[PDB]
């Protein structure tokens, strides 16, 4: 269940394709927050026309090394 959650967040709430286009300028991030009490400030500029929380799981690197190019595969 944890793995499927990771993959789904990379599929739906990520900037994985933008990062795939330019890896060393875009910051990977696969989690966004809801604008409830001003916490949306945590949705920082991670580049790629995307605002989220920069992740450190190294999942983007795994997905790139496995050959995953679209979010349909995720």
């Amino acid at each position: 269940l944890w793995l499927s959650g990771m993959y789904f967040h990379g599929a739906r709430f990520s900037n994985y394709e933008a990062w795939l286009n330019d890896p060393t300028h875009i910051r990977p991030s696969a989690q966004v927050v809801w604008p409830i009490v001003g916490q949306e400030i945590l949705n920082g500029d991670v580049g790629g026309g995307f605002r989220g929380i920069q992740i450190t799981s190294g999942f983007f690197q795994i997905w790139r090394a496995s050959g995953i190019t679209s979010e349909l595969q995720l």
């Binding site: 400030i41 945590l42 929380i53």
Partner: protein, 74 residues
């Protein structure tokens, strides 16, 4: 102690930015070879110096890290 050693040594002798001539400016200019030999060096050059980033996190998208810093202290 192990992770502190790793982090300081990496930020001091490996990581950093390369440039056009091949001049490597590291995150800290080899401050591990001369400052890590006394405890005052760890308290000043590692914790006090590196700690400034997290303290100034408030008001930006890294604010959650500052909040967790203080909450974990608590």
């Amino acid at each position: 102690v192990v992770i502190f050693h790793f982090s300081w040594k990496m930020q001091s002798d490996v990581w950093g930015s390369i440039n056009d001539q091949g001049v490597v400016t590291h995150i800290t200019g080899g401050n591990f070879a001369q400052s890590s030999i006394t405890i005052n060096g760890w308290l000043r050059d590692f914790l006090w110096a590196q700690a400034s980033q997290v303290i100034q996190s408030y008001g930006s998208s890294l604010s959650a890290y500052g909040l967790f810093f203080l909450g974990a202290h608590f």
